[PDB]
Amino acid sequence: ATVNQLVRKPRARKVAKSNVPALEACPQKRGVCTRVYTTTPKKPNSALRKVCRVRLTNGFEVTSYIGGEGHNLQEHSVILIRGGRVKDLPGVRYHTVRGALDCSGVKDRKQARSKYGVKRPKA
Amino acid sequence: SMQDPIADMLTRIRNGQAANKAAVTMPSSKLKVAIANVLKEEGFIEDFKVEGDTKPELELTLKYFQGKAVVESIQRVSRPGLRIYKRKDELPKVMAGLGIAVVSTSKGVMTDRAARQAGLGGEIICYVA
RNA sequence: GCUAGUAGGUGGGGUAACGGCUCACCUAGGCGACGAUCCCUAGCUGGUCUGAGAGGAUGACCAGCCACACUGGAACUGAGACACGGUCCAGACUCCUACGGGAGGCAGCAGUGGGGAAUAUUGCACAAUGGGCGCAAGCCUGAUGCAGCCAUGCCGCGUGUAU
RNA sequence: CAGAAGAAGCACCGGCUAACUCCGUGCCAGCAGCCGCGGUAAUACGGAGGGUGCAAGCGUUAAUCGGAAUUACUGGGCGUAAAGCGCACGCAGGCGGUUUGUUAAGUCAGAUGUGAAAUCCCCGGGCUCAACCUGGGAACUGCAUCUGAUACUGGCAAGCUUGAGUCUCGUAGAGGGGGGUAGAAUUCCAGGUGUAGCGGUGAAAUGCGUAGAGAUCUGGAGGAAUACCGGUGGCGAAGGCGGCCCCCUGGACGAAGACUGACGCUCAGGUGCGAAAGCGUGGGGAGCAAACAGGAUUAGAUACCCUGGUAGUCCACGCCGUAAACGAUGUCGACUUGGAGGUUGUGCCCUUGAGGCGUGGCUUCCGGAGCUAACGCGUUAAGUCGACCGCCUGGGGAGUACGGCCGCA
RNA sequence: GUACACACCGCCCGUCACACCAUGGGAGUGGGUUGCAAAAGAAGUAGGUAGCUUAACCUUCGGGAGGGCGCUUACCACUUUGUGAUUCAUGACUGGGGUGAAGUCGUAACAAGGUAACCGUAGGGGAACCUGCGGUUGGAUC
RNA sequence: GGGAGAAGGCACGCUGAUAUGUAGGUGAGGUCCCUCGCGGAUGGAGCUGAAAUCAGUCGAAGAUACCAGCUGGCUGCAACU
């Protein structure tokens, strides 16, 4: 583009949309689980991944992953969610925070405990 | 149409050097002559002469050192679509001072070093290296 | 496409002051693709973060400027206000009442409930700096100086040394 | 004073990325920023041992800039990757050959005022150090005013001819608009001769024919298109333009001059032209032929093939405004090795003709340097530069929806 | 020549059936904001003034001037009415789109893809598509 | 072209002033000219006369009587008179 053309119409920056709109630029958001269930991943993976449909304090209704082996979540559980997509799960853009609010930690976890809300064992 | 005789002069020099021409010829002007004087003084060209009265013609004798053109690169800086003026403290350095910038100052057309010595800014006509 | 006090002029009025600030009359003008009008968002700056730079993003703390003070409107007093802890009217809420009628405004400091992923003590003192009044002494000052809580950040140190 | 006495955790270890083995599991449980990992010998899941990185912190999430030259002013692109408007004329706007004088607006130099303090930076000072506090400077890249410089750009005045244009003579051309006419051929009509097939296909059938077809001869009607010439030939802004004749009319080119004196280039918006199909009104209709019908083929055959056939193709006027409207290449100007051709001018010379030597315009193929991801382009550039405009910013959704404008649709 | 590379036993298109998701239309209907035309008129300020009432000044001692209250007019907040605009939500039904999954129907494209492909347009068809007219080569063979 | 008088709304009597009656209309005498008449020009007396604005004023009510559109939304059918 010539300088005259840029004087007439300047260069325009492309606006980037967030991949986590339901957080509304907050580090976490609290929600109430409306459904807790399992779902199968996209090919080439196969599993029964644990997810929950949750309604947030801002009215957004989203799907959140429940990481770790085993969980204590059911309908009406109050949980905290954070950003983070699950690649093989269609439309799962958030992760449940283990060890916050009604979500317990993972039993018998010894490594990466802080990522799953597990206290230090008394050994 | 023709709208930048100075860029035309520079391009004639560039293309003649690329084509290994002994000399290049063009219609003359006082500004072209001043630029030719700077080029000759800095040793980028061998000589120049103006011939004719009503339609003056400027001829520049190009030089080659070891089978290679002396003018390695010549580039218009200020142009009709975008004029470039620099103050004395912001005069450009060409090839870390190994080349020259032709500058039009109120004391005439000279190199960037000469303009710095005179303490003048001006219009940056071209870079030569 | 927008504009009839609209643009300008004359005269009267008005203000501390110039001015369509206001009124009467006259002219038919004025703004706009160098984006008027309308719609959405937004306190502005010194600065801050990032970047080699040019830029991009941003405006918490500190300082300058502006605006607001439950919501809407108004003036009074005064050098100065259309006035956070003044006045009057209206409105929504809360409260008192003998049912006629009355009272109130933490976006001051601390604190409570609520919302939220999340942000502290209903502390000490005017000793210092500054402010109000006073001849002064002095009184007042949640400004301020300090103290309490929090790994929130930056910086320093330790959790031993040698064998 | 006492006694090591009261004081270490968090993430990671397949690649990016520093750090590897065993066991458990067996596309399960699970991991994941991406590439991906998990299927019975998993350095990728989970535990352990060992190791790596940070450390009173360590990880995760959110958010900004960076990397991203991935909006490119510095600092990108558009033949085929996304991208040149279908083609033009042209207002505003941007840009402007050459000489002299003048002006000093841009530009440049100096000075003055201001650019709060704090913050950033430099040299120092004080807290045991550091963070922190602090003295002075630098900086605040800006604005205004004054005084100077005049090369370049702008303004003003006067010129100049090389850009651009006018005149004179001639040349080629399917350039355009209007009218007339000619010959070939198809179809239809009438008549003569004549008799059993014709037509069609891969083979058939539908169809036509003893009510006399097909074939052959003669006469007539009518519409549409112009064989040969004809050519990587010509003309035109593009779309496009093809028998012959007349009338009206546009552009290009060449040779000598004469004339004007920068009158120029580009162009958002605007306006005009714009194949075929399609639309409206009125005509026309031979041949062809969407739709449609029948016959075939086939598993089917809403096709390809066959027999028919209506809009339409044609004319007048109006609308539509799109095409792989393509060189998938915007316009204008300058510059940079060569070869072989086509076409159309013109100068000179000779022994005078398929003659020789030049010099212009347009055009086809090859190829050098250079350029390009490559393919290729290559003086008609996609090379080297300048002026102006149009356009692109991952694939799909989508040139779609909604709104506006235009249109009879 | 190629759109094939576990390499034509390749690749691959669309309707239809199933699942999920966002979105256009939709009898309309509910909110938010706002334009225009009016109605309204608390308090305040300003102008006027029947009526009532007055500490300072002047009186010829009766009053006068001036002031205040009340009343009235102008401006205007709340509020009300009518009709538009815009925006958000929602709506039986309906349009196409994306994703997944592969079930039914075919085989349009890639080789000359078995009728070269594609562009504009028009008509037709369950579907990919077919046909006419002009155009392109980004067509194989010759 | 319409829809449209869409819808909805404001003003309206009388008195005085502007102005002893205004803008406008009409137009005599007088004066000048003339190709002298049922003429032209000027001139304005007299007559007639809206509408508006400002101020005031009466009533419950000023288009006061008679007279004199109800309006809007969805839809079937027929183009229309």
Ligand SMILES: [Cu+]
């Ligand atoms: Cu009481």
Ligand SMILES: [K+]
């Ligand atoms: K897998």
Ligand SMILES: [K+]
């Ligand atoms: K005004």
Ligand SMILES: [K+]
């Ligand atoms: K005035």
Ligand SMILES: [K+]
């Ligand atoms: K005035």
Ligand SMILES: [K+]
């Ligand atoms: K910066």
Ligand SMILES: [K+]
């Ligand atoms: K800034």
Ligand SMILES: [K+]
């Ligand atoms: K307020």
Ligand SMILES: [K+]
């Ligand atoms: K205050």
Ligand SMILES: [K+]
């Ligand atoms: K004090």
Ligand SMILES: [K+]
């Ligand atoms: K095993």
Ligand SMILES: [K+]
């Ligand atoms: K650039």
Ligand SMILES: [K+]
């Ligand atoms: K100057």
Ligand SMILES: [K+]
């Ligand atoms: K000058």
Ligand SMILES: [K+]
């Ligand atoms: K001609």
Ligand SMILES: [K+]
């Ligand atoms: K003819």
